């Protein structure tokens, strides 16, 4: 007899939403998840929460899954469109279970969902992304940041993601994630005492203490063979001393004036420390046990170039960096080089108490370089603050005669659809116990009064005071393609628990 | 055990055949599945969904093997067909566990339903040319509509239909289409194909190797027809040979069947309808269980109805009405549920498919009859 | 620690809500009817809302509350209870959708309140005037169609539709003088089937005599009250018979003043004791009515319906005590007999001689008679008469909607409230199609599509609702029409009945055994 069933898994799978409720806005709280063996990791991510959490209903389950392809989507509060899609399905029950045919009704969404896209087209913001002007880069860094960490962190990162999306571009709009990629993760001071470093950063350093803690020129060479000898013994260590003289001729060769210039050692494997006395006088730096993913790297920054033996050397091959400093922190000694040959690539130093800690910096880093780099790759933005909440609600809530495309039920599926996009803007505000009714007065009817004035005007809402703001004077801004597929993907996720009659329990057994 | 047991066999395909009631057309819904693993399995396709779940009513595991055999003609519409042969069952009860009719007694009716089907079919014949492109291009246009790449179908489905037609020819007509050889290339756009009439590995025009990740390019010149396929996408080419790959039944049964019928579940209106007047004129004692199958052939087109929202009571009303007393061109709309005839509906499918949905379906249903009972724990 | 405290939601609704789908299945026409069954084996089916609530049992402690507001529905409506409930139960959900979000319950209580005062002054502009003195009986057999068609089936409907129309204009005049209290007169029988119901303009007495040549049916007759009685006792024996024998020839004559040898002239008796056999030769030989073992209530009745006088001694005799009747008919069904009493003069009451066999079927009829009269009684006392079949709970929330900031001009916050109120006003012809078997949404789309073209066609009209055909209609054509009092308290106890359950965030149990 019918279904039935439909209700009954909605049910089970609106508790999901509601663990999410607290999730959305810069005003919500983060989630902790705990393992069996002490490790705990406090983030708003979606794809680490509905991983780790394992819910008894197996419809929240599957549904869990979609937010994988989000990544490349947002990245940065997906639990927009999980709640966005809870209301959704509890506006059809209202409907379907009075006897609305779900398929007539869903027909009333995908319509309204292609006419969104439309009303979009016309609501998107073009910018000029060639100027690279500070002042929409700055406001673009604070629609992240103040959305995942505080105001104290946020002055603090803001300044290294924009100085991060600009050494990564072209006139031609060229971006690679992947040229950025090495960030230190170190545990000391605290996490608001991070830095953007200008360069590459090496986890090995050398063990000798007296080298050059600060060098003004230094020339990087990968050095493939081994300095030290290994096996077939006065001869053996003979060899080393005749590799010695090449390098020390060569540091005469290039500059024999003033010694105002360094070079620095990459070696694979260890150096006899009795060996780098020699290198005390000559203020050269010496490296062991260097990973091939960090030489390959330095070959496309630094400059240098592979040589295996040194009985060949040529300044061709020799790179350069604008500043070295070492630093020796613990046991572990690191080296800190920026304004290198081609230094189109940085890293972002991260300090800390533990990893408890670091993992809210390492995660909102990675997709807030990335939010910013869609801005310089589609010129068009969205305004944030909620202001396409109501804006793309109105649209479709007056009809009449003029535009509406559908009719009978079909007709009331557009009219669902207004009201399911008014639950994220009447969340933002209750997880800051603001009442939602009062703030439409001074936001919703705003719009109507700068509609007789005969001018396009988009207003946010302000979460500190609870009254309207303006989304260019705020500063949060969102790009075309987050939107654009968050909304279109919302409703083909939701369509799967709409387009489901009943769950039955079979299988293999 | 006797009686008792064929009523759990009854059961056994309805609740299956309920399952499917809305897997039919463009509308089709979705069934979400949950196996002891903790798996789940969302699909409009009831493929897989029979082989996936283990069923405990050994009655079921019988059609298991008859999607089998459905799916290896056609595949995309033909599942649903399993649903006749639930109604047949369930339509036994005021008889077989009631009026105790013999199960032979109710096969010899199905023996007679069925020859009687086959003259039906002839009734609603269509044949129509195959020589011109753009009426074979609609017609496999047709099972394109329940997939988004109807607009894509432009420079995919005229290459399905290039390709038979030079590896089908005549002989009958009946030869092998089995020697085509379909490559595709992951990655690119959708719309970029390959035009290429030859064998791939006399006076030949060029010769050229071309530049592709996968393989290089070869020519030979004979005195057989390959496709190149180029996906819009990576996992997209699953889909892209259910839509020629496996719509290549539909140039296979253009060849043997030409006539067209409703499509769309429009097929059975005319046949429920004539098999009602047939049976008036039997004046035995199985023309109550011959007159019965009629009753079985309206429940088909109800899942359109239950798909569209509307009342399959009210609306076939009119709906048999069209086709008993007006003509038997008419049809459903499976979309909005309306009663726009098929012949403004633009789609057609060959006698062949109704045929063949017919033919298993009885002789699946007579089957399930001759079995008395079922026993266990023999401990093979 | 603080937190503590309680949250309004659905549990307090379960109590509440409980009867809503209970109650929905009944509603309308098409409704079903419910039965009550006992230990012995009396079965009672109705739908009324005496059964409904005081005779049904539940656990829900909102059903007492429910039962209890429902005795002003009953006195002063009684049909269509239903209704009303279903009111609260939409309202009920709505709270899940605007109090769950923060909004305090005494806020949509503003909207209740104000669309009191909005339905009043839609409710005048919305009722039909309607001369009551000229007598027309084309509106008195719609409403009475209309109170059947949703108690009865149609056969039953179309016997009763002209003999309620008749049994209330009996006692209405010119003056709108209408009194239920002194007519009643509810026979309880089983006979024949309740098809077969017939109409009485007269008191019907349940006694008669036993003996075999009393008359059945006799053109008139002089009905002589006496209370005391002349019979045969066990007193010696001869001086109780002097005052007998005494008086009887006084009876008789008593009938030779008023002529009684004309064949066109009855007499008749009434005794309130038994009478002996032996002296019923005497009426006999006479061709003279006797009756024995009469009721004190039915004696009384006889002076106000007869037109005569009541008279204690037999001593006592004057032409002004013997009444009068234009047809004189007795029935005897069983041990006992009933003469028919009608064709009066003057008539004061009448009667609805009730048939039916089974138990519940002549409780069916029993209320549905009542209550279908209770229904046309007060379309004579109201001089306006109100469009039904859903008339006006459709135009209503339409009049809601157009006029909001506009009037009443709300600051946002009882917006919410005054548009919850409109939600449910469609609730109740939502279920009328429900029960025909329609698509509920889709025709009551059908019927909002003609309202947009009545606004614009600047005329005077009201749309109705066709359960039959489905499609908008005429309340005039269609013939449903409600008085003005059963709407005027249904309206003004729906926003009671709703706001005191909202007002309950927090149940409690404690007090003394």
Not at chain 1, 58 to 81: C, H, S
Not at chain 1, 186 to 191: D, K, R, T, Y
Not at chain 2, 215 to 229: G, H, K, Q, R, V
Not at chain 2, 238 to 267: C, W
Request: proline share 3%.
């Amino acid at each position: 007899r019918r279904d039935a069933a439909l209700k009954v898994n909605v049910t089970s799978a609106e508790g999901l939403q509601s663990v999410l409720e607290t999730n959305l806005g810069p005003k919500g709280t983060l989630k902790m998840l705990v393992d069996g063996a002490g490790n705990i990791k406090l983030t708003k991510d979606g794809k680490v929460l509905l991983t780790e959490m394992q819910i008894q209903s197996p419809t929240a389950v599957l549904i869990a899954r979609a937010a994988a392809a989000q990544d490349e989507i947002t990245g940065d509060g997906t639990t927009t469109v999980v709640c966005l899609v809870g209301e959704l399905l509890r506006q059809a029950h209202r409907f379907i279970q009075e006897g609305v045919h779900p398929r007539i009704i869903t027909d009333g969404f995908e319509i309204a969902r292609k006419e969104s896209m439309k009303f979009l087209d016309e609501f998107k913001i073009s910018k000029t992304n060639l100027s690279n002007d500070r002042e929409f880069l700055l406001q673009v860094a604070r629609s992240s940041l103040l959305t995942k960490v505080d105001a104290d962190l946020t002055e603090v990162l803001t300044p290294i993601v924009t100085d991060a999306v600009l050494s990564v571009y072209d006139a031609q709009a060229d971006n690679l994630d992947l040229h950025m990629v090495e960030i230190m993760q170190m545990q000391h001071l605290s996490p608001k005492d991070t830095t953007f470093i200008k360069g590459l950063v090496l986890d090995h350093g050398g063990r000798h203490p007296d080298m050059p803690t600060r060098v003004k020129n230094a020339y990087v060479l990968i050095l493939n063979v081994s300095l030290e000898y290994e096996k077939t013994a006065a001869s053996e260590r003979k060899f080393v001393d005749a590799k010695l003289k090449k390098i020390i001729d060569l540091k005469n060769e290039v500059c024999g004036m003033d010694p105002d210039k360094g070079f620095v050692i990459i070696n694979q494997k260890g150096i006899d420390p009795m060996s780098l006395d020699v290198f005390a006088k000559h203020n050269i730096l010496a490296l062991r046990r260097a990973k091939r993913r960090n030489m390959e790297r330095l070959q496309l920054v630094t400059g240098g170039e592979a040589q295996n033996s040194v009985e060949d050397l040529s300044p061709q091959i020799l790179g350069f960096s604008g500043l070295v400093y070492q630093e020796t922190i613990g046991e572990e000694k690191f080296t800190y080089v920026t304004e290198n040959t081609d230094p189109k690539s940085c890293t972002i130093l991260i300090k800390g108490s533990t990893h408890y800690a670091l993992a809210q910096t390492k995660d909102a880093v990675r997709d807030g370089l990335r939010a910013v780099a869609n801005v310089l790759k589609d010129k068009n933005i969205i305004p944030g603050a909620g202001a396409f909440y109501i804006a793309l609600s109105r649209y479709l809530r007056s009809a009449n005669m003029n535009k509406l495309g559908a009719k009978g039920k079909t007709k009331t599926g557009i009219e669902a659809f207004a009201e399911a996009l008014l639950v994220i803007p009447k969340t933002l505000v209750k997880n800051s116990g603001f009442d939602p009714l009062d703030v439409l007065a001074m936001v919703e009817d705003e719009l109507d009064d700068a509609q007789d004035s005969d001018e396009t005007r988009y207003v946010g809402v302000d979460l500190n005071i609870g009254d309207s703001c303006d989304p260019t004077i705020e500063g949060i801004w969102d790009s075309y393609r987050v939107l654009r597929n968050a909304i279109t993907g919302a409703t083909g996720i939701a369509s799967n628990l709409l387009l489901c009659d009943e769950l039955l329990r079979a299988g293999r057994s | 055990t006797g009686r008792q047991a064929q009523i759990s066999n009854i059961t056994a395909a309805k609740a299956v055949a309920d399952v499917i009631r809305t897997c039919l057309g463009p509308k089709a819904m979705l069934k979400m599945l949950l196996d002891p693993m903790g798996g789940l399995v969302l699909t409009n396709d009831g493929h897989a969904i029979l082989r996936e779940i283990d069923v405990a009513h050994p009655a079921a595991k019988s059609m298991l093997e008859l999607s089998r055999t459905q799916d290896e003609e056609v595949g995309d519409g033909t599942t649903t067909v399993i649903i006749l042969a639930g109604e047949i069952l369930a339509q036994c009860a005021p008889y077989l566990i009631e009026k105790n009719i013999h199960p032979v007694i109710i096969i010899q009716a199905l023996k007679k339903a069925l020859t009687d089907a086959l003259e039906v079919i002839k009734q609603v014949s269509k044949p129509v040319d195959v020589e011109n492109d753009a009426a074979m291009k609609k017609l496999i246009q047709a099972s394109i509509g329940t997939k988004y790449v109807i607009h894509w179908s432009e420079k995919m489905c005229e290459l399905a239909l290039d390709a038979v037609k030079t590896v089908r020819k005549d002989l009958f007509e009946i030869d092998i289409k089995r020697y085509v050889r379909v490559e595709k290339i992951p990655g690119g756009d959708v719309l970029d194909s390959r035009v290429l009439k030859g064998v791939l590995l006399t006076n030949c025009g060029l010769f050229k190797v071309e530049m592709i990740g996968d393989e290089y390019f070869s020519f030979l010149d004979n005195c057989a027809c390959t496709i190149m396929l180029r996906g819009g996408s990576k996992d997209i080419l699953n889909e892209i040979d259910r839509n020629l790959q496996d719509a290549m039944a539909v140039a296979r049964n253009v060849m043997l069947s030409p006539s067209l019928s409703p499509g769309g579940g429009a097929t059975e209106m005319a046949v429920s309808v004539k098999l009602a007047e047939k049976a008036k004129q039997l004046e035995g004692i199985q023309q109550w269980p011959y007159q019965a199958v009629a009753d079985a052939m309206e429940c088909i087109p109800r899942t359109l109805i239950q798909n569209a929202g509307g009342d399959p009571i009210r609306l076939l009303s009119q709906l048999r009405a069209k086709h008993a007393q007006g003509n038997f061109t008419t049809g459903i709309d499976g979309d909005k549920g309306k009663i726009v005839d098929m012949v403004s509906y633009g789609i057609w499918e060959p006698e062949v498919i109704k045929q063949q949905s017919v033919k298993t379906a009885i002789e699946s249903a007579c089957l399930l009859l001759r079995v008395d009972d079922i026993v266990s724990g023999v401990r093979k």
